[PDB]
Design a protein around this ligand. Structure first.
Ligand code: HEM
Ligand SMILES: [C-]#N
Length: 153
């Protein structure tokens, strides 16, 4: 699909829609995660010892926000420039994932959790053209972090 001026326009628009509700979209995101894979719970410091996913935990919200911002930034960067740029941040990211016991097969878990989360976020405006646009942008960013993990291991 590439990322036409028209496709980028579509990702920006849908991300703005996500940020518009962090405590919701972020708790939803962790539930979609634990749906696709329950065992994942022991990983998160703020999930351990708990029985259910905390709904107003600042640690949790700050965490999941950061995750979606990163995927959006990635899509624009693709339309403008044609690529995703690796920086200091993406590299520190890669370190912390390894400390915490995270692997590559974990990644389609967090992807589907995000496509599903955005399908839920844009509702009827959903198009093939848009699905195609977020899919392209995750894939392209995941490719970059997995790259930094393997490097932190
Ligand atoms: C493109 C995809 C992904 C993005 C953009 C992303 C982003 C992030 C960010 C920004 C942090 C916090 C770093 C800090 O400031 O110290 C983090 C922490 C973490 N991530 Fe991810 N991540 C991705 C995929 C995954 C996957 C697939 C898993 C496995 C389920 C995972 C598990 C964790 C855990 C356990 C922590 C530590 C949280 C703690 O105990 O406090 N991440 N991630
Ligand atoms: C990352 N969650």
């Amino acid at each position: 699909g590439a990322l036409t001026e028209s496709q980028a326009a579509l990702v920006k628009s849908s991300w703005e829609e996500f940020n518009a509700n962090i405590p919701k979209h972020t708790h939803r995101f962790f539930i979609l995660v634990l749906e696709i894979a329950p065992a994942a719970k022991d990983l998160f410091s703020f999930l351990k010892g708990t029985s259910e996913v905390p709904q107003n935990n600042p640690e949790l919200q700050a965490h999941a926000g950061k995750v979606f911002k990163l995927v959006y930034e990635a899509a624009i960067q693709l339309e403008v420039t044609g690529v995703v740029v690796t920086d200091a941040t993406l590299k520190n990211l890669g370190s912390v994932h390894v400390s915490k016991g995270v692997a590559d097969a974990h990644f389609p878990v967090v992807k589907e959790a995000i496509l599903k989360t955005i399908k839920e976020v844009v509702g009827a405006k959903w198009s093939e053209e848009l699905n195609s646009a977020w899919t392209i942008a995750y894939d392209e960013l995941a490719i970059v972090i997995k790259k930094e993990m393997d490097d932190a291991a």
